[PDB]
Design a protein around this ligand. Structure first.
Ligand SMILES: Nc1ncnc2c1ncn2[C@@H]1O[C@H](COP(=O)(O)OP(=O)(O)OP(=O)(O)O)[C@@H](O)[C@H]1O
Ligand SMILES: Nc1ncnc2c1ncn2[C@@H]1O[C@H](COP(=O)(O)OP(=O)(O)O)[C@@H](O)[C@H]1O
Ligand SMILES: [Mg+2]
Ligand SMILES: [Mg+2]
Lengths: 113, 244, 221, 232
DNA sequence: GCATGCATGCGCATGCATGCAT
DNA sequence: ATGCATGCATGCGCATGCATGC
């Protein structure tokens, strides 16, 4: 939040006081920014599943709002990926993965009906 | 809160009726309440009471009786409790959450004036050789029941706080009124589920009565007749339409 | 005397309302709707009472609910500064002015006094409440009776009194989970009860969506 | 309990136990009866009241002033108090017996314990209402008309609250719709309307059931408002 | 299973009133 | 004759025990 901005300003002032300089220069701001970033720790649980789910939700909601079935969705996703997959083995593996993910989303997560 | 020549009346009535004395006394207990002959007989037995016995070894045998009434709403239990309160000489009403264990049982307070510790009597201590009526008995907490257990067993209260210890007499009798856990008495379920009380508490009670509001047309007709006859009544010597 | 003429001349301006709306909270960036609602609350309305049977109040109570870091307290501080009779209090505790009336010997003057709540002291004024969801049972009951009946009844230490509490209430609050969820209703996102929410005329919802341009402008300010 | 009344659910909308409910003499239930023509009347009435509050404060048609009404009520309460008569007592006896028998029959047929029982307390409440009606006229004895009015009021309030054919018919429609619908299937509103009109049920009941299901969240709109689908 | 709300004893100092020993 | 120690509330600060609510 903005409290982080105030903390950054305070840390820059503290660093300037430490170095006895009369003005705040970008080095102190960079140090404060680095320290604040190192303070934050990411949560460990998966990202690929979230990205695929978000893409599916975005596509389905765009289709619904602008104006398909499960097979149509899978075909559209494969068509979009076409430029990214070079071999048939990877294509079929990704197809199985997305089919399982869609089944989980429809049945387990209840996100899609 | 006695006459002189009513002794002759008492002697004549006794020597005449003999066996019918108990039946007539039970029947005329409360005209305002219709039915419930066994409950009236039990209340009369409470009014009369048993005999306390003391033996050579100092053992004590209780002589008081305890009765618990359970039933559907609007079966005139609170009315009976109020009538007992009015008629009994030393009658004390104590509802479920109205008084706690410290109020029912005497306590110790340190006097600031002299620095000593004194005893303040509780509700049951005051009602020696009397009657204590407890409406909404089911709402009472477990600890209060445990405290009441000693009085119901031997009619004595033991108190001890460092520097003072005493035993007070609590030879009293208890009326209790409670509602079923389900609000209305379920006919199909066993009485154990409906009452929902531990075996020790029921055992320490002497009599258990179950009252039901059976919607029989003849009983309803008789009850309505009695209720409206009582409601239409006006005291003699009072002008009709007078306020109060 | 000349002030009245100046006010009348200002009222003749075609954009007086926009000027008044923009004047509130100069140090707070954005939130035009909040400022407009606060202006409407400050100007107020007119109570009505046909005979002595049906009373209708004219005060406009305002409730703001928002995520942390949205400067909810600054609006309350500015309103306290502007208002001639404004009483500020917090539901967290250790407030300078209490929210419940009581009779006590004052620690300073050592005299037997009856101190009323902030609602009574704010009669014909403004009452600002911060941390509206941290209140206890007594404060909630007092606020409910002051908002419904517009009066406070006291029965303590042999004293039985009824006091008027005609005031306008402005409150600030945060969501239950620390972040507003659009998928749920406003009632489900606040610890308050429906009858309390129903009293407020204006409800404002503040969110912290990441807009790079707005964030850059706020940082510059 | 749920914040707004659910007509089809009937009971379980009251959290109070039957014990505390037996003490109350009368229980009234108010619902938001949504009529297009009614809302306009309410809005116009409110606006007219707001406008006329500033100018005039006068009785509409012979209405008593607040102070006069207060003094009159106090005088009536202080002065006299009436009691019932024999014929009214017999009529009330017959009506109470019939009502209790009907309540027992309804409880047996519905196979569910009513949350609003009928006991001697209700009879005493009716007696009290009749006595109040007689007291209102300063008469020393009540008449049959007062008893009839008290019985009408007690019926309209208590029997309507407790018995809460329209609602049973709505329950029938709800059961039929639950049996016909399936999870994940789509149904057109016209199909439902045609199916239930061929069964000769009123359209308003169907619309009310659909609105209640929408409130609960079982029914959702797929394509605009023409086709519905079932959720849980 | 524990922290907290609500009495209650403990120890103390402080203020207001009065009653008379040096 | 006069100034002071004491009896009687009352605030202050504290610890301790009983009940309950999550
Ligand atoms: N629009 C804004 N313009 C200027 N400063 C802002 C703005 N929004 C937030 N701030 C700053 O954010 C800081 C956060 O403190 P502030 O008291 O305003 O927070 P708050 O919204 O009341 O938070 P809390 O939810 O913790 O009570 C303040 O120093 C304030 O100046
Ligand atoms: N058998 C009966 N005869 C006469 N009156 C009755 C009878 N049963 C109930 N009533 C009336 O109904 C009321 C019941 O109230 P109450 O005694 O408080 O019920 P409960 O004690 O079961 O809660 C009483 O005022 C009483 O006048
Ligand atoms: Mg009773
Ligand atoms: Mg704040």
């Amino acid at each position: 939040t903005v409290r982080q901005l105030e903390s950054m300003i305070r840390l820059s002032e503290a660093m300037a006081r430490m170095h006895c300089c009369d003005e705040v220069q970008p080095k102190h701001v960079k140090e404060a920014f680095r320290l604040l970033n190192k303070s934050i720790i990411r949560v460990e649980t998966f990202s690929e599943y979230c990205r695929i789910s978000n893409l599916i939700v975005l596509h389905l909601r765009k289709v619904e709002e602008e104006e398909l079935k499960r097979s149509e969705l899978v075909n559209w996703y494969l068509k979009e990926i076409e430029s990214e997959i070079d071999s048939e083995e990877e294509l079929i593996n990704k197809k199985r993965i997305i089919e399982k993910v869609i089944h989980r989303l429809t049945h387990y997560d209840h996100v899609l009906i | 809160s006695f006459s002189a020549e009513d002794i002759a009346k008492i002697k004549k009535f006794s020597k005449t009726r003999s066996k019918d004395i108990f039946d007539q006394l039970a029947k005329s207990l409360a005209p305002s309440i219709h039915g419930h002959d066994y409950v009236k007989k039990a209340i009369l037995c409470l009014l009369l009471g048993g005999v306390e016995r003391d033996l050579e070894n100092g053992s004590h045998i209780r002589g008081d009786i305890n009765i618990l009434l359970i039933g559907d709403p609007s079966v005139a239990k609170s009315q009976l409790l109020r009538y007992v309160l009015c008629t009994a000489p030393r009658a004390i009403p104590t509802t479920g959450r109205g008084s706690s264990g410290v109020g029912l049982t005497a306590a110790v307070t340190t006097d600031q004036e002299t620095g000593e510790r004194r005893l303040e009597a509780g509700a049951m201590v005051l009602a020696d050789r009397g009657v204590v009526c407890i409406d909404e008995f089911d709402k009472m907490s477990d600890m209060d029941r445990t405290a009441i257990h000693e009085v119901m067993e031997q009619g004595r209260v033991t108190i001890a706080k460092a520097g003072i210890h005493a035993r007070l007499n609590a030879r009293c009798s208890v009326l209790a009124a409670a509602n079923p856990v389900y609000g209305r008495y379920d006919q199909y379920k066993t009485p154990m589920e409906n009452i929902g009380l531990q075996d020790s508490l029921l055992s320490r009670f002497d009599l258990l009565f179950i009252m039901l509001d059976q919607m029989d047309p003849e009983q309803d007709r008789e009850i309505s007749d009695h209720v409206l006859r009582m409601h239409r009544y006006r005291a003699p010597g009072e002008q009709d339409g007078d306020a109060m | 005397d000349e002030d009245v003429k100046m006010i009348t001349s200002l009222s003749k301006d075609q954009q007086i309302g926009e000027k008044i709306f923009a004047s509130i909270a100069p140090s707070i960036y954005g939130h035009e709707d909040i400022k407009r609602g606060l202006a409407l609350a400050l100007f107020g309305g007119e109570p009505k009472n046909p005979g002595g049977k049906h009373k209708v109040r004219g005060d406009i109570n305002v409730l703001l609910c928002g995520d942390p870091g949205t400067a909810k307290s600054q609006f309350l501080k500015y309103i306290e500064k502007v208002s001639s009779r404004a009483i500020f209090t917090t539901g967290q505790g250790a407030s300078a002015v209490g929210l419940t009336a009581y009779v006590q010997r004052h620690p300073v003057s050592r005299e037997w006094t009856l101190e009323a709540g902030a609602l009574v002291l704010a009669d014909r004024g403004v009452c600002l409440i911060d941390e509206f969801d941290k209140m206890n049972d007594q404060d909630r009951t007092s606020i409910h009776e002051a908002m419904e009946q517009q009066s406070i009844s006291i029965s303590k230490a042999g004293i039985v009194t009824s006091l008027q509490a005609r005031c306008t209430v402005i409150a600030a609050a945060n969501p239950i989970g620390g972040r507003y969820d659009p998928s749920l209703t406003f009632s489900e996102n606040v610890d308050l009860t429906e009858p309390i929410i129903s009293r407020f005329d204006i409800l404002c919802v503040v969110r912290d969506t990441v807009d790079p341009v707005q964030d850059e402008m706020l940082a510059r300010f | 309990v749920f914040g707004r009344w659910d007509e089809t659910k009937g009971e379980d909308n009251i959290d109070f136990m039957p014990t505390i409910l037996s003490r109350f003499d009368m229980i009234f239930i108010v619902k938001d009866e949504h009529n297009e023509e009614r809302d306009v009347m309410l809005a116009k009435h409110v606006i007219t009241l707001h406008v006329s509050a500033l100018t005039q404060t006068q009785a509409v048609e012979g209405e008593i002033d607040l102070a006069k009404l207060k003094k009159f009520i106090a005088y009536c309460r202080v002065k006299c108090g009436p009691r019932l008569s024999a014929e009214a007592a017999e009529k009330l006896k017959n009506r109470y017996i019939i009502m209790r028998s009907g309540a027992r029959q309804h409880e047996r047929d519905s196979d569910r314990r009513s949350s609003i029982p009928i006991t001697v307390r209700q009879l005493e409440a009716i007696v009290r209402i009749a006595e109040a009606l007689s007291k209102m006229k300063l008469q020393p004895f009540a008449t049959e008309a007062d008893v009839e009015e008290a019985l009408r009021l007690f019926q309209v309030s208590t029997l309507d609250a407790a018995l809460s054919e329209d609602q049973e018919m709505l329950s029938r429609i709800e059961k039929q719709l639950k049996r016909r619908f399936a999870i994940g299937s789509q149904v057109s509103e016209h199909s439902i309307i045609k199916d239930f009109t061929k069964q000769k049920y009123p359209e308003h009941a169907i619309h009310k059931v659909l609105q209640l299901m929408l409130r609960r969240g079982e029914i959702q709109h797929r394509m605009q408002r023409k086709v519905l689908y079932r959720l849980k």
